Swiss-Prot record:
The chain holds residues 27 to 178 of 228 of the full protein. This is Cell surface Cu-only superoxide dismutase 5. Belongs to the Cu-Zn superoxide dismutase family. Cu cation binds at H51, H53, H69, H129. The keyword Glycoprotein applies. It comes from Candida albicans (strain SC5314 / ATCC MYA-2876) (Yeast).
Length: 154
């Protein structure tokens, strides 16, 4: 069995010009490949922490309603090795988003695409913050492909 790929789609509105995607695809050796492709960032208030948060973005697009970080193993915001960070603290482990546009690829060995895992991130959300913590934009983590099953194509 292999678990399905996920995506978070950020859209531009009157609240934020940030738009683009963060894709999560199963990779080699027990890791998930993360692909960040964002533009429209308000650079001078960055760099921009971003994290997996615990609740969905509601229809209102209120990023506060995503509540706190996904942290099933009670990690710490400051850490000296990647595994000591919260599972959801992508920026702490891999770097803050920065610039007006940001494109990067990396592996994360703590998030999970397997819905039976305590580290599963499906159905959660991602929030992008200004450096001072203000929530700028957010997106739900949803399935990437439309068609699944061992007898299907997409
Ligand atoms: Cu966050």
């Amino acid at each position: 069995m292999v678990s399905p790929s996920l995506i978070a789609k950020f859209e531009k509105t009157s609240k934020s010009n940030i738009e683009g995607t963060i894709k999560f695809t199963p990779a080699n050796n027990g890791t998930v490949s993360v692909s960040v492709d964002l533009k429209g960032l308000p650079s001078d208030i960055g760099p921009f922490p971003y994290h997996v948060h615990e609740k969905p973005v509601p229809a209102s697009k209120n990023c506060s309603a995503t509540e706190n970080h996904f942290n099933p193993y009670n990690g710490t915001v400051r850490a000296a090795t990647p595994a000591a960070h919260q599972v959801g603290d992508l920026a702490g482990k891999h770097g803050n988003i920065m610039g007006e546009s940001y494109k990067t690829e990396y592996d994360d060995s703590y998030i999970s695409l397997n819905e039976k895992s305590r580290s599963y991130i499906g159905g959660l959300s991602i929030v992008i913050h200004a450096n001072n913590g203000t929530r700028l934009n957010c997106a739900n983590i949803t399935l990437l492909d439309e068609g699944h099953g061992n007898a299907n194509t997409t």
